[PDB]
Amino acid sequence: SQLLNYIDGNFVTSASSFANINPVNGKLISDVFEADAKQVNEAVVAAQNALKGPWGKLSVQDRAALIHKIADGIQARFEEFVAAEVADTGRPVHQARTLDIPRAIANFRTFADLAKTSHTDLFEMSTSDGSGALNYTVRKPLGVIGVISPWNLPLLLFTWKVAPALACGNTVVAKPSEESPSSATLLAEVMHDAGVPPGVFNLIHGFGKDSAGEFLTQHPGISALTFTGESKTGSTIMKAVADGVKEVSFELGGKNAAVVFADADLDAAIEGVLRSSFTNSGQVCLCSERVYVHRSIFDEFVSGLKVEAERLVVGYPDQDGVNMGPLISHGHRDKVLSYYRLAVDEGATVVTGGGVPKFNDERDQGAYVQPTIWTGLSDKARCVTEEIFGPVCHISPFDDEDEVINRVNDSNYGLACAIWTTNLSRAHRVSRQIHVGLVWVNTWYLRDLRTPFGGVKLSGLGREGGRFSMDFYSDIANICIKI
Amino acid sequence: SQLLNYIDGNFVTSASSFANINPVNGKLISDVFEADAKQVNEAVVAAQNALKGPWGKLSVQDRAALIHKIADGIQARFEEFVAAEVADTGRPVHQARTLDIPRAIANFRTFADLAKTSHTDLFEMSTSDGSGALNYTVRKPLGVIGVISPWNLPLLLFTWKVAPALACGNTVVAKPSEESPSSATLLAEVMHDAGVPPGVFNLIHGFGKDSAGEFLTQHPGISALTFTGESKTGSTIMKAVADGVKEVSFELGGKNAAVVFADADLDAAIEGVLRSSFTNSGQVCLCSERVYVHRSIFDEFVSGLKVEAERLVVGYPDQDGVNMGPLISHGHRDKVLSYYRLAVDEGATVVTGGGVPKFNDERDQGAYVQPTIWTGLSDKARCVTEEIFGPVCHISPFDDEDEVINRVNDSNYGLACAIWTTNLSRAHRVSRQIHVGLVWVNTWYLRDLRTPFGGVKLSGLGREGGRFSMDFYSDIANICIKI
Amino acid sequence: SQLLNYIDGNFVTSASSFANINPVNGKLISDVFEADAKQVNEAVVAAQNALKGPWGKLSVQDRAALIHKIADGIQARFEEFVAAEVADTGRPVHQARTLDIPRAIANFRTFADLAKTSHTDLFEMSTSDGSGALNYTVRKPLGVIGVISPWNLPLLLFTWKVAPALACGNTVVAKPSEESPSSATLLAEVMHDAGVPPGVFNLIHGFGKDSAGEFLTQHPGISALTFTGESKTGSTIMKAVADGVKEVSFELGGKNAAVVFADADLDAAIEGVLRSSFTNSGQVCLCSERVYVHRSIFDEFVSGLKVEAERLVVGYPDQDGVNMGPLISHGHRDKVLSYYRLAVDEGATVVTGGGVPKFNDERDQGAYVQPTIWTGLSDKARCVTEEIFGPVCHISPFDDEDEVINRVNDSNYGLACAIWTTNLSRAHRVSRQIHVGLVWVNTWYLRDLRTPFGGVKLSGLGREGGRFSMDFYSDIANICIKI
Amino acid sequence: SQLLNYIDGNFVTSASSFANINPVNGKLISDVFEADAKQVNEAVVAAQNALKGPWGKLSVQDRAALIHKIADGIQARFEEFVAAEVADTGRPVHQARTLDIPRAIANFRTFADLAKTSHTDLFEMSTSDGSGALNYTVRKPLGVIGVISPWNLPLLLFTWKVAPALACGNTVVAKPSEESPSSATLLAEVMHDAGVPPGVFNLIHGFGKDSAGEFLTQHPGISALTFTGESKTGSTIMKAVADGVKEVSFELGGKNAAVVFADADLDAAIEGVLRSSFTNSGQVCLCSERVYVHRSIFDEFVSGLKVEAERLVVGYPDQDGVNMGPLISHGHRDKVLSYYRLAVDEGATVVTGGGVPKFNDERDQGAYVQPTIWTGLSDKARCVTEEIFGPVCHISPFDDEDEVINRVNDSNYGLACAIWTTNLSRAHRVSRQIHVGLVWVNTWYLRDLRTPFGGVKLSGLGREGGRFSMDFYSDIANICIKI
Ligand SMILES: NC(=O)c1ccc[n+]([C@@H]2O[C@H](COP(=O)([O-])OP(=O)(O)OC[C@H]3O[C@@H](n4cnc5c(N)ncnc54)[C@H](O)[C@@H]3O)[C@@H](O)[C@H]2O)c1
Ligand SMILES: NC(=O)c1ccc[n+]([C@@H]2O[C@H](COP(=O)([O-])OP(=O)(O)OC[C@H]3O[C@@H](n4cnc5c(N)ncnc54)[C@H](O)[C@@H]3O)[C@@H](O)[C@H]2O)c1
């Protein structure tokens, strides 16, 4: 099986290729052609030209209809997209089917609808001569949007950027993660088959440094770079586009906390922290890797979580009651197991997990690890401060509300937090004091595409979602008429 | 020893001082204490800590009242601020009195008012269990705002950042231009006398590279850097904050066009382009340095503009009919004159100006140049494409509408444009096609503080004004309650 | 044919029926069962109950999809809807096909979209005790919406109300005009086939006074009455709902002017006023019945419009180049011809028309009149001040801009106005001074569903369109949480 | 003393006068001159004319500044305003001082501020010919606003209407309650001394039916009638303006509930219901006259409330620890005592109060009654369903959440409700189900002037507050430019 770039309406190979590997069993899924600098230039230029072609002449309404057509096309190939996400990543099929693929479809439909409903502003003003002036704003396409995305929820995060970009009338050059190229390549097929004009959507495959990703970031022809990934990568990209002063929007790492207050529904909080720590095998940017539980219920919480964690089924994506697939790759697993050893070196108690399961079948050639809970580290331990991106959490007791707020906030990251409490005042009083972009109370990972989304501190720069997307992916121009 | 830093509620000197020179006559006005890195650190830490003191406990209504007090305090010392602005810059007293200081005061009043009226959003959503969830947003202080400002409209541009920063509950570390330190120092005393708590507003003086500006830019304690100045400096700052992923907001250079169609009110357009070319001796970022005039009215337009330009009075800030003061510095004057010569070398006709006036008095020791009009350069001439930031414009003829639109947009800058036409269709049709942040029709430099304001391409990153400032200077946090 | 009511998911007949006559030839199209007070009661109660059923449990997203399905269901039977509107009203087929049915579909699709994208407000406040409070707002269904609609654009105006009502989660009892019952009845079939729950949409046929219209209006079970029709009728309805303080939204009569300035594109203005005067045989509330033309071009304009009006083809709905059908009914034609005579009596010069065309075939039994232009009446003439609602206009000269603005505003009505001028300032200066809900410049009847729509003075009460509909058809509720 | 009307910038008397009685001691405070129909016409015509005068030429910033000048004028005579409100209404001095006058001043400042920051909308649209069109909206003054207001919080409720009316550039004819004419008359002096142009604000004294209130409501010269008062009065006014189709905004009666759940903070709930029942001697429209308390805490609740109610000091407005003044007048006291008896006759147990206190001084000639608590009535009792508007409440046990929601909602009124609970889910789940305009959770009568305010069913029509006021008190006009 082979995955080509899609540039100016044509699927094309490249001089070099790389392997896409199935993390479940370590087997080759496909060969992926790595776009070189010459090909990235071709994509950007094609995207610049497409802005002046038929795409650029579409009414907002016709543009929106075509985008609903893109979504219809994904839906018409639903299970192919499910199979592509699962193969690349080891994601349980049930989660790809009910969450990932429908959300990627919803991304297109929501931003197409926002495109149709969105409007801008009128400001009247007085002038010296008494005749007045009017200032009105308009939204125009920003230009060519460079999209660079990660491997953890590949189609969802890719379309989260591509949908608003296109809804705002931009053209796109998009570089998915080398670990998860397939569903982006299928999306290119859907675009083609839907009649999306050539150059409007371009797909380039490859890596970051000295590859497609870096070349995209360096190209003078883009107007913006939108990015989801590691904070360090964000910094590198920000430096790269600096001379061009390109617009930038970054969703970066986190080390998210969950707080369980004494008045929590304890069984629910146990279930919720279980989901927030081990969903996608801890490979969601929104996962909790630090947990704070009031001292009065600490021991009961930890015992309860251990029992639930140990009932998790780790195995095949379509295995009967499977809860966790593997990590994305052998390389990522090396990093996570290296953090497993560090926790022990730092003096953790391993409440459960802390190694890899033994399957005695092909899964032993994949990249699985066990769900893991630690106890007994200090707030300054590396395993409590650094993002691990695996199925892990450290649990720590606390006594006082102001205390735990400060401890949650004591971080260079600030993406998300989940809080468990049945008390009205506490929910609102505490939530507003947490230094993050997103707080959930008594739940986790609930998303409404209308809301602003982003992080603070090292977890990002800017916000997207709803009108924040419509603003980021557009030129906002002011036109002032003297009457 | 005259102009001090203001750090954590105290005026402090520094280890070294630099001269502030009057561009009217080259005389020493004052010595300015240059903040060193240790003092910049002290300012950022004090601002960090002030977020945790009484300032951070004010209601939005009390904060807004205090900000109106700052405004009142400027008003109460109105003529001192005029004198300080005039001394530093050579600005005509009439202009500083009727435009600069009033507009500085309006920045504070407008952002104080917007702080009281602003609200956020409520999103209801359905959930699988049928009980729903509520998502709501809140604006919170972003943190410590680093402000780095330019010399051209010193107090106006300084307060354009400081007012929204404070209105959103932030604390501030602000570095005005080394060329124009006085009004900002007076503002520090106004803050002090109004009882702004210590650490909320801090003033550090100095240069850019290897001085207070660079140091502010590198400090991990700030949450954002908002900047107005040269594009190259914007790039440098973007790189400097990259490792911290700090929020950035840049208002950068331009090479703005004016366009005059055959159906313009010719006298009004001549008057308008005279203002847009030579106001503040061509030292406003929004000035026109490129002008395109329809061939049918070209000669008449140039002839009329020459007449009006030669009637401009260039002299003392309190001289009876003064229109233009000097340039900001000898150093800037040398650069503008280097362009004056480049224009001739590039083949220009000098319609008027092209040199420095001879005053036969102390003004000859200052930094004056003549209002200058060029004709005969090609679109690729350096003098037609690089920002000069002096009292100059090149005038070129055009024939077709799509032609002049292309020539206007054929630039790495895109700050503003002015269009002169009496035709309703043309006004709206052409304006929407100009790739800039701001288009004026039949006027220039009308500003309503509610409007989004910014540039595209090298002219900027992001937008400020109205809700765009309220959003930039705030954390926008989403709180999601499961019901 | 027979047209039944639709009450609680069942098509039902009534004790009595009335004739629906084809205005083309006077022939019987169908019998229509007239709802009595008892059936109106059944519809209202069923509507109240359906609010507590499955309809009320739908998510906004599922409600919007069901509303898109209604729209699909109309599309699926598009030509039946065309044939129904044409039969009832004599509308040229081309207009019904390109304008009326597609707009009725768009009403559902647009308000379904708005429902998905709409949100509400979050207000934070300080309190004495320093802990604060949160006020958030929600949009809830108002309840049962009573809809009473007119005969001139039957399906379009009927769905303009029913779409937002349903999109906001309300249930509906709707009473279309007795002259034009067919497309509304077809719409009930679409609702049924699409699986809209019983009681959500109820259709009651009948008249106004002493019939279904009045009975709806008196029923204490409705929460709102939204209405489009004559100002007099509006006044009657307002009195009727007064004891119950029902929410009301009225779009009422007009006596709309067109103004043609000396710098107009004259040929385009002639064509414009032709359309605004004689579209739908002058039976649109937005038509121009008063026209003011600058003295310098008055004679040429009148002569030009005469020529164009005499070129209009008045004939069968599917006749080759047909432009005008008949009036709605013999009774309406009696009223219009009564004004034709009054005009002559008031001293008008009949420039063209002023009677009935003679066909010498079955159309002579229909309700046709001639397009008519008058000249020579004073501003106080009844024919210049009272709404005729036929294909007529009076044309008068003017000299001065303030004079003509005053003459346009000298009316108890204030729905719309169209202005013709090529001049940028004049367009904006004059438009803002016209005391109406809607001004068009160099066009007429361009409608964007997101805009506010409504009239002033006798022409209405309230606004609909965009968020104004979302607000009118919802309870806006404030919830204040003390923290 | 004498209270004059204020018409076209002159204080004027009338042919007839009526007495203003102090309810504390039944002494005459002043004679009030009753506007006749001719004086009302004179006021309306002056307001119409003033729209075309200097008022109408003010920039929004100058208008706002003059409105702040009105507020300043009130502040400068603060204690005079306090004395006026106290004299008229018997309201405790501390309450008029810390709440009523300050809030009246804030009404002006807040709507002045909103006027400066408010803006409107721009909609771009595609057209057949590919050139497009622009629709923009503007806010214009609606015209002459008729204001009719109640006696319970005279200045607060008066200025709640007058402030947005004027902030939106309208002119005003205002008729305060005959029971409380003083603070409004003082306000006219402030308007006069602040230099508000003649005709902009006109004050007419008199009664309702066959007096100034009725004449206002019948005058064809107004553009809107905004009203706060009884529901039957609202219905009367709605009929009165119907023929002119005037815009209407009604804030009408309530029979508001408070609900105390088992998990409430009991002492806080007891204090909260004490305030919500007996504030202003129960003469606020927002007061709780019905209380539902969970069965498990009902007895403890009633006993607590009895104690706290009996601690209330009923007496002189300036008496040391005074909590309650008298009722507004002897007539109102007759109605309230009539209810007190009816409560007995209907089966009520009197837990406390139920008659009039005995002073043995001039207060016995006043209009005092005792704070009263009933128990043992059915949900259908008149005393439980009809608004009494005195310091009274009935308390009833409940068991189930859905039960008490249904009992709260089983009312022809729907103004406000307060809920007491410490549980997060319950607070939000129950609040959204209460069919009123305003729900408070764990507090009462907290008011943020940006929020929408209004009632459902008999409690009102329309919303006011924040942009809801900016919309109601303005013409929203759409201007569509074909390009
Ligand atoms: N709205 C706008 O877009 C706008 C408005 C006004 C001026 N400008 C631009 O500003 C420029 C003129 O002002 P200027 O000469 O003062 O610009 P500048 O870039 O040379 O300096 C501006 C500020 O940045 C500081 N600075 C310089 N180097 C720095 C560094 N390495 N690190 C941190 N800070 C540094 C300076 O000390 C000064 O305070 C023009 O390009 C003009 O177009 C833009
Ligand atoms: N936010 C609210 O909804 C709110 C607020 C405060 C008071 N209220 C209500 O106000 C009522 C008590 O106030 P009130 O006793 O002064 O009401 P009142 O209705 O009887 O009338 C108040 C005003 O209306 C005038 N008026 C009376 N009859 C009129 C008529 N026929 N035509 C024109 N004007 C007429 C009166 O002169 C007076 O100025 C209560 O029902 C209370 O619920 C409601």
Residue numbers in the entry:
A (entry chain A), B (entry chain B), C (entry chain D), D (entry chain C): 18 to 500
Task: Quote the passages of the study that discuss this structure, keeping the authors' original sentences.
One enzyme in particular, 2-aminomuconate-6-semialdehyde dehydrogenase (AMSDH), is responsible for oxidizing the unstable metabolic intermediate 2-aminomuconate-6-semialdehyde (2-AMS) to 2-aminomuconate (2-AM). On the basis of sequence alignment, AMSDH is a member of the hydroxymuconic-semialdehyde dehydrogenase (HMSDH) family under the aldehyde dehydrogenase (ALDH) superfamily. The complete AMSDH model includes four polypeptides per asymmetric unit describing one homotetramer. Each monomer of AMSDH contains three domains: a subunit interaction domain, a catalytic domain and an NAD+ binding domain.
In the structure of the co-crystallized binary complex, an NAD+ molecule is present in an extended, anti-conformation in the amino-terminal, co-substrate-binding domain of each monomer. The electron density map of NAD+ is well defined, and the interactions between the protein and NAD+ are equivalent in all four subunits as shown in Fig. 2e. The NAD+-bound AMSDH structure is similar to the ligand-free structure with an aligned r.m.s.d. of 0.239 Å. Residues that belong to the NAD+-binding pocket are also well aligned with the exception of Cys302, Arg108 and Leu116. Examining the wild-type AMSDH structures shows that in the NAD+-bound binary complex, Glu268 adopts a ‘passive’ conformation, pointing away from the substrate-binding pocket, and forms hydrogen bonds with both NE of Trp177 (3.2 Å distance) and the backbone oxygen of Phe470 (3.6 Å) to leave space for the reduction of NAD+. The thiol moiety of Cys302 is 7.14 Å from Glu268 and is unlikely to form interactions. The electron density for the side chain of Arg120 is partially missing in the binary complex structure but very well resolved in both ternary complex structures.
